[PDB]
Structure 1
Amino acid sequence: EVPLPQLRAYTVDASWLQPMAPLQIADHTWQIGTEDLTALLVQTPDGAVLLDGGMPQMASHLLDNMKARGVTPRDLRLILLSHAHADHAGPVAELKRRTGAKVAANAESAVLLARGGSDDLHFGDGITYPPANADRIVMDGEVITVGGIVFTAHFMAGHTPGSTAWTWTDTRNGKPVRIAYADSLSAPGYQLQGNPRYPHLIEDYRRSFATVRALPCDVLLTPHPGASNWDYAAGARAGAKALTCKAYADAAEQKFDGQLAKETAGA
């Protein structure tokens, strides 16, 4: 008895995933996700780029916000990812089915996306989402040019093996503005030392702290806005108190060092 779509009961907090209207970050860069999850739209004369989508259920809201910005399903050309977890790559598969968009990702993020976040290094099969295929594989430092906007990939392995920062230069009030979309640097509940699924985890995190610190970075944004002290609901004040790349990296490294001290302490 009971149809398959009725066998599951998902936990849902009304406060999660509050929709918002497009919030302008620079002349061609908008936040079009929710108050609590970043999804960046970059509009160019040669099509639009979307960096992350948030949770699987966010597809229709993303498309509504795209329409409001004048971006039709045919105009969405490129999807880029911070890391391929359910709360950031959730709606990618559906977006691909409903638009012209294609996915560029590094090999690690591509394999994780293609298996829908299953067999996660730390969370097993508890965070699975609709799988999607990558259309282009990128290497570290590779650049993708869309309508004269140049995006560069900076690998920062740790939170996932394929964690990536993307940097591009927009304009704001005439001047160029160097935007850095830096992935998470958290290790939440992770076994850091002697982890058989990730033997060099600590060394990778250490290098990614240094990579983030050194990013070309007039404006830092992060997949979880709280992580860089953005407040997307605050309208034109949303970025007032945003961390620098240095400070974001420094805070992450201090938390990480604290977790590692706790894991390493005797019982």
Structure 2
Amino acid sequence: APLPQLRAYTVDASWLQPMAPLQVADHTWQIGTEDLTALLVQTAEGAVLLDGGMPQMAGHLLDNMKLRGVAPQDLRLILLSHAHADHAGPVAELKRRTGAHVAANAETAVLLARGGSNDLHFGDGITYPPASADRIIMDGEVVTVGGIAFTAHFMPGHTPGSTAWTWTDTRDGKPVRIAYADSLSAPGYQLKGNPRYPRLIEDYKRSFATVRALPCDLLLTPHPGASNWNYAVGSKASAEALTCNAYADAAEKKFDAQLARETA
């Protein structure tokens, strides 16, 4: 009776289904897969990448950047929603091949430093190549690349360092406020009495109110289904997209029902 073999982190095939660069605004592009968000922001002084999806998506992201006329040495910054294998996966390979820097808060940096290992809820079941954050960011801090200002909004819950990013782009000259809000889900998390996360419920509740008050005209999430984005239809992808109020309100209802069932 030998010890069990290691089991690989397998996902649905749609998470690894590549797609062409879908345009979100004048400078914002979706360059990930159909069910995983990876936002590219093109400025005059370089490019910014938000999330990267699964670790094996590193080659696909560079091809889309090549399609948008972005050389690897033009990627200047990498911002993260939260440092899980399905979002910060290819960060390590992207740093070695692009010369880009990574900005994250202390909680995301320490989770990124150990490659998702020793997760508060998943243990070591979702490991990915570790990377190091080059700039430590605080709540409400502004990061500027090529004139576009990125304001950080801490929304702890899914991970201790879950961060939502807001920036103002344009759509035919008219300004649009984009809000890339992180996941508000707790899949299989022990909500009450968790010794690894004692104030988990208080952080989720504060994060619900944080997402409601985000300056947002167009909302995006790491998993596009959470905000009803459908990258497959391309032109009509943002048709049924939720607001920040509707996204946080629906997430809180599923959180309260989940908390009530945990006490049962």
Q: TM-score range by the shorter chain?
A: over 0.9
Structure 2 residue aligned with 1:81? 80
Per-residue CA deviation, residues 8-63 of structure 1 (Å, 9 max, x unaligned), is 76746544411000000000000000001000000000100000000000000000
* Unmatched 5+ stretches in structure 2: 1-5
Equivalent position amino acid for 1:215 in 2: L
* Unmatched 5+ stretches in structure 1: 1-6
Equivalent position amino acid for 1:74 in 2: Q
Separation in 2, partners of 1:71, 1:220: 25
Alignment map for 1:86-125 (pairs within 5 Å): 86-125=85-124
Structure 2 residue aligned with 1:242? 241
- The answer as to 2:207 corresponding to 1:208 is yes
Equivalent position amino acid for 2:135 in 1: R
RMSD over aligned CA atoms reads 1.2
Per-residue CA deviation, residues 188-244 of structure 1 (Å, 9 max, x unaligned), is 100000000000000000000000000000000000000000000111100000000
Give the TM-score of the pair, scaled to structure 1: 0.95
Separation in 1, partners of 2:8, 2:161: 31
Separation in 2, partners of 1:92, 1:197: 26
Give the 4+ runs in structure 1 shifted more than 6 A.
7-10
Separation in 1, partners of 2:109, 2:39: 20
Equivalent position amino acid for 1:127 in 2: I
- The answer as to 2:124 corresponding to 1:162 is no
Separation in 2, partners of 1:194, 1:168: 36
Give the TM-score of the pair, scaled to structure 2: 0.96
- The answer as to 2:197 corresponding to 1:198 is yes
Instruction: Mark the CA change 1:52 to 1:15 in structure 2 (over 3 Å): closer, same or farther.
Output: closer
- Give SS of 2:256's match: helix
Instruction: Mark the CA change 1:55 to 1:146 in structure 2 (over 3 Å): closer, same or farther.
Output: same
Separation in 2, partners of 1:9, 1:79: 26
Alignment map for 1:21-60 (pairs within 5 Å): 21-60=20-59
**Deviation of 1:173 (Å):** 2.2
Separation in 2, partners of 1:29, 1:123: 32
